[PDB]
UniProtKB/Swiss-Prot annotation, chain B:
Annotated binding of alpha-D-glucose 6-phosphate, by residue: H120
Function summary: Glycogen synthase participates in the glycogen biosynthetic process along with glycogenin and glycogen branching enzyme. Extends the primer composed of a few glucose units formed by glycogenin by adding new glucose units to it. In this context, glycogen synthase transfers the glycosyl residue from UDP-Glc to the non-reducing end of alpha-1,4-glucan.
Domain of life of the source: Eukaryota
Protein's organism: Homo sapiens (Human)
Clinical note on disease: Muscle glycogen storage disease 0: Metabolic disorder characterized by fasting hypoglycemia presenting in infancy or early childhood. The role of muscle glycogen is to provide critical energy during bursts of activity and sustained muscle work.
Residues of the whole record sequence present: 382 to 508 of 737
The protein's name in its UniProt record: Glycogen [starch] synthase, muscle
Similarity remark: Belongs to the glycosyltransferase 3 family.
Gene name of the encoded protein: GYS1
Tissue specificity comment: Expressed in skeletal muscle and most other cell types where glycogen is present.
Subunit relationships: Part of the GYS1-GYG1 complex, a heterooctamer composed of a tetramer of GYS1 and 2 dimers of GYG1, where each GYS1 protomer binds to one GYG1 subunit (via GYG1 C-terminus); the GYS1 tetramer may dissociate from GYG1 dimers to continue glycogen polymerization on its own.
Entry-annotated residues carrying Phosphoserine: S31
Swiss-Prot record, chain C:
Residues of the full protein shown: 23 to 625 of 737
Described function: Glycogen synthase participates in the glycogen biosynthetic process along with glycogenin and glycogen branching enzyme. Extends the primer composed of a few glucose units formed by glycogenin by adding new glucose units to it. In this context, glycogen synthase transfers the glycosyl residue from UDP-Glc to the non-reducing end of alpha-1,4-glucan.
Residues engaged in binding UDP-alpha-D-glucose: H183, R189, R309, E488, W490, G491
Pathway: Glycan biosynthesis; glycogen biosynthesis
Oligomeric form and interacting partners: Part of the GYS1-GYG1 complex, a heterooctamer composed of a tetramer of GYS1 and 2 dimers of GYG1, where each GYS1 protomer binds to one GYG1 subunit (via GYG1 C-terminus); the GYS1 tetramer may dissociate from GYG1 dimers to continue glycogen polymerization on its own.
Residues annotated with Phosphoserine modification: S390
Protein name (database record): Glycogen [starch] synthase, muscle
């Protein structure tokens, strides 16, 4: 309300390291009008990041120029710029060149103030604290040199900026404080290390488990920041439950991350981009299985699962045993429906697999041998239509063309079952996905109604096998199944829902909890939500199959309606809707720190 | 006639691709083409109508362009006199092009140096 | 109702393919093929040309039907019972109109002691209609006689050509319920142009005088009498119902609007996919017809569509031409980038195509030739550059040869003269009502003009040198289909438009426009603009049309798509599924009125 200058503090600002970068990428537009030009982004300085993202500019206000000049003084570095990303974000890039002065003197101060020590072994630990003092310096100077300074909000993202949170309030600078944890630090190691992490979220000895992993300095850094914040904020309501029972600070507001959504001129252009991308997947599955194309591709479905290669976290284990049962239900029942599940999770690869790479080259061979004799037919028809005669149709193709086509069919034929992995792996037997595939019994056989393709790399437009982008490949697949146990927010299930493609999310996922909260209808709107908190592994697998078989039994027309319904939920995941929550958080903090000038509006 | 030639090239490209797509899903399936079902009733009606539009009763023209003085033109006057109206019975068809060949031409898009090389014989009686 | 009853659909257009009634009867077959099942039959004229295409002969299922067919065939009359090959498998009783040996004079003398209507020998179909009339009454008569305890029969009569055989059934007093469905008022057609303000003077028109002045009295008398000798009188349109109330002198009991069997695509947006595909093929035409004069953004261009028989006053081309002349002003005096390319697809007498509409297509092709040459040459130089490992230089991709090729293409694709209005050459160019108006209003397809009028004097065909696309596809390509009319009993040209996703400007005088006013409350909101032409002058109607056209012109890309999706929803209204519920009321209304005890009143 009252004019004020706020700062968004994160490590991922002009770094491009984590997913927090992608959050603040498109957050800049919606926050660029709510506080206007007054808002800033405090971030670390990298010379690599400047050449790409940062364009340096002078200070508009004379107080800011004094603050930047003073920041240059005392062996500290500032590089005020403007981020080249859309929104016009004015960025305050602080270098680690101030390592000589801030780290040694203020580590003792941090000890006399926060009582948190930093091990020298951990690299980003010493780098985070430096960045922490540098932020407090800039905020401190901004409050001091600006006469009658408006209420300040310091918006802190991730553990790396969590240290500078307690310092901004340690110096008692008149500043309202927000901490937005996009992922709980201790929650990541607790997810796999401790069984039933969600079930035992209350039980977990909060100090013991952090110390067993030698991450205590980091948990202590993430906490304290929580306690030394008026408004504590989580992206997910499931992460809010995490913070309530582990970080021990209940999130004041839940501000879910948002995606800028591409608005097309036609509201059905996503469905036009569906058929175009489906055909490019059709060129792949026609090629990968050659001589084994005894399945109707007109009535075939594509299931999609992506993310970092985490077998338990990105819930590949749930989805693999579910397709094994979907193998049964589509085979014991007289069904023509074939499902081609794609596993796009990048891992260590030597090179491309021989038979897959051959299959694509024989695919074009059976396109070349179907273009040569096609042109023969084309000329014979053009010279028959010009004469004035309908093609005989039994003399259009010569004996040579039948020998060409007869040899094309002889080359294509294979006996070996089509491969499961698109690439060749260094550790094939040790690979958790490939080990499960051979266990469940899906070798991409003729009898199998589900054929598993594991592309052990990110997709690229410049690829020998599958030359399509990630964004395009999602739009091609019919359904995007994302079972999860530990996703703070689903950046992959949600990018799916931003597009017209329906996504099977889960209750433990941040996206799935958001869809349960906002909209009342789960399956009706398209987004299937899997109960994984109050259910066993086996029930969760079976619920996936009832969800998968529901989509399998769906008709052509009903699939299109559901894909149109999922398009309507893009507005819900737009920064336009999901940035309202952050705006409330900023307003809520000002009220907590300084009540008289700013109305709380609670 | 030039537009019809491209029309009978377009109607011979549409059903060619329809032949090609049905063949490619026949070669991939593992079966040589049937060769009789390859073209549907939709394709046959396209080709049957294309032929019906092609049909002309007028004999193809002696001069490619339209002249200001057609009757006064010494070449065209001789053609109608000798009796070569580009008929089916005629074994010689005379095709006068009243203007220089060009590559930027709606009809006959070939330049003079290329057009000479295309023709089998270059007859030049002179006085 | 629909229990223990038989319906005979009697029309001249049954297995003939002459008029629009053929399409109505053909399409109605499927919805009527389950309401009365296999029991319904269609009585029609017999043509050996029509049999080879449409009729497959079959034996009689019921033994009584064999008796009826044999007795009529034996008693100096000709019948060819069979099944129509159109969808719904209608069973057709093709009666030979060629068998005129004795009925022509003896039966006409019987017609005069009964109906007191005489037939002139000069009029061909007049003598053929009455023959077909007696033959129907014979078949119905035998069917009632030889079938012991016969279910009540509903004789469903379409057009004046069957209208004579209507009164015979009542004259014999055979137990038969009777329906007459006039798809177009006979006397209304000549009154439309001959008498000024036909709709305004519909009550005033001297009903017997005007019929005699044009020597159609035998047929007006034939169409009337059929009306009076029918329990249920039925009109296709509510505007035709007003016509019949003051011309045929019968208020139509029900209005059963004609319907189209809509093509439903697996995707509910496939019409809009077929929009862009067909728009591009129109874009290829607009790039050709206008060459060297292409200074108009084609992304922001609209296509207006008008079709039908070549009737300048009836199909309301006069209204639409003076309206584009004002739309020329409103899009030019206001700083607008919007260009509108109106297409007039009304077939007329043509000699051949036009030099500059076929040369423009040829230069469009040369500029696709001299682009494809310098693109493959670009492509080959690019392919050998990416393999070496270098991004294309972009100043050295194209050589000096390519610049000379492209520079000469640009020189050839230059014209001083403005693009042609018509896309063919006419026999009577000056006498042509459309072309005369175009030169009068001042739209010569100029650079300054924001509306360019193209009149394709012939029907669209896939096999065409200039514009190779079907009629069905061309409608789907155009943004808006404007159909002003004065006398369209039921507009199928605007009707088929609304079946597709394309919005259509109908009128109050049209049968389709009156239907859209009656059923749905929202006119312009649902897409179908309705023009007031009954209570307004010519000039006001042109201006109402201008405000309707300018409303579509000021519409954005996105708002156009929404309206086209809304017009798709109105296809269900024009489906025989929604429009055949009206014929069912007419049949139900008849069984009851003719035979009250057996069939419920159904009011
Ligand atoms: O994805 P499916 O349910 O197989 O449906 C396939 C359909 O996808 C899109 O909607 C396209 O626009 C249609 O042309 C296609 O028929
Ligand atoms: O017809 P317009 O309003 O110019 O819109 C043009 C649009 O038509 C359809 O909806 C197509 O699917 C779109 O690809 C295209 O953008």
């Amino acid at each position: 309300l009252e004019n004020a200058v706020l700062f968004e503090v994160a490590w991922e600002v002009a770094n491009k390291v984590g997913g927090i970068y992608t959050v603040l990428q498109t957050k800049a537009k919606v926050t660029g009008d709510e506080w206007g030009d007054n808002y800033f982004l405090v971030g670390p300085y990298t010379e690599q990041g400047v050449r790409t993202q940062v364009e340096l500019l002078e200070a508009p206000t004379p107080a800011l120029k004094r603050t930047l000049d003073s920041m240059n003084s005392k062996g500290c570095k500032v590089y005020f710029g403007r981020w080249l990303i859309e929104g016009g974000p004015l960025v305050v890039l602080l270098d680690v060149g101030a390592s000589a002065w801030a780290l040694e003197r203020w580590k003792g101060e941090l000890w006399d103030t926060c009582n948190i020590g930093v091990p020298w072994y951990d690299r980003e630990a010493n780098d985070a604290v430096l960045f922490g003092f540098l932020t407090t310096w800039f905020l401190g100077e901004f409050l001091a040199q600006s006469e009658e300074k408006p209420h300040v909000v310091a918006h802190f993202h991730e553990w790396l900026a969590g240290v500078g949170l307690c310092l901004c309030r340690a110096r008692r600078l008149p500043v309202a404080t927000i901490f937005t944890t996009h992922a709980t630090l201790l929650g990541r190691y607790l997810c796999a290390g401790a069984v039933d992490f969600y079930n035992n979220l209350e039980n977990f000895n909060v100090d013991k488990e952090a110390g067993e992993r030698q991450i205590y300095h980091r948990y202590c850094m993430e906490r304290a920041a929580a306690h030394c914040a008026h408004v504590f904020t989580t992206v997910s309501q499931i992460t809010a439950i995490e913070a309530q029972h582990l970080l021990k600070r209940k999130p004041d507001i839940v501000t879910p991350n948002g995606l800028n959504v591409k608005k097309f001129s036609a509201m059905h252009e996503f469905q036009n981009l569906h058929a175009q991308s489906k055909a490019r997947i059709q060129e792949f599955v026609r090629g990968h299985f050659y001589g084994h194309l005894d399945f109707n591709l007109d009535k075939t479905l594509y299931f999609f699962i992506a993310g970092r290669y985490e077998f338990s976290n990105k819930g590949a284990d749930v989805f693999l045993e579910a397709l094994a049962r979907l193998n049964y239900l589509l085979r014991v029942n007289g069904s023509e429906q074939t499902v081609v599940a794609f596993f796009i999770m990048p891992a260590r690869t030597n090179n491309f697999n021989v038979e897959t790479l051959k299959g694509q080259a024989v695919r074009k061979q059976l396109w070349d041998t179907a273009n040569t004799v096609k042109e023969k037919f084309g000329r014979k028809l053009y010279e028959s239509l010009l004469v004035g005669s309908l093609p005989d149709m039994n003399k259009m193709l010569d004996k040579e063309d039948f020998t060409m086509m007869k040899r094309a069919i002889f080359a294509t034929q294979r006996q070996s079952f089509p491969p499961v992995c698109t690439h060749n792996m260094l550790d094939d037997s040790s690979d958790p996905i490939l080990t499960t595939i051979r266990r469940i019994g899906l070798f991409n056989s003729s009898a199998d109604r589900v054929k598993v393709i594991f592309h052990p790399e990110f997709l690229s437009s410049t690829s020998p096998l599958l030359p399509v982008d990630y964004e395009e490949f999602v739009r091609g697949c019919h359904l995007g199944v994302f079972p999860s146990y530990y996703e703070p927010w689903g950046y992959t299930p949600a990018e799916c829902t931003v597009m017209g493609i329906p996504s099977i999310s889960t209750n433990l996922s941040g996206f799935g909890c958001f869809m349960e909260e906002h909209i009342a209808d789960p399956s009706a709107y398209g987004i299937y939500i899997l109960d994984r908190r109050f259910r066993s592994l086996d029930d969760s697998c079976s619920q996936l199959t009832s969800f998968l078989y529901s989509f399998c039994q769906q008709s052509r027309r009903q699939r299109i309606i559901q894909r149109n319904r999922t398009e309507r939920l893009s507005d819900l995941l737009d920064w336009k809707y999901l940035g309202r929550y952050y705006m409330s958080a900023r307003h809520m903090a000002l009220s907590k720190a300084f009540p008289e000038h700013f109305t709380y509006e609670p």
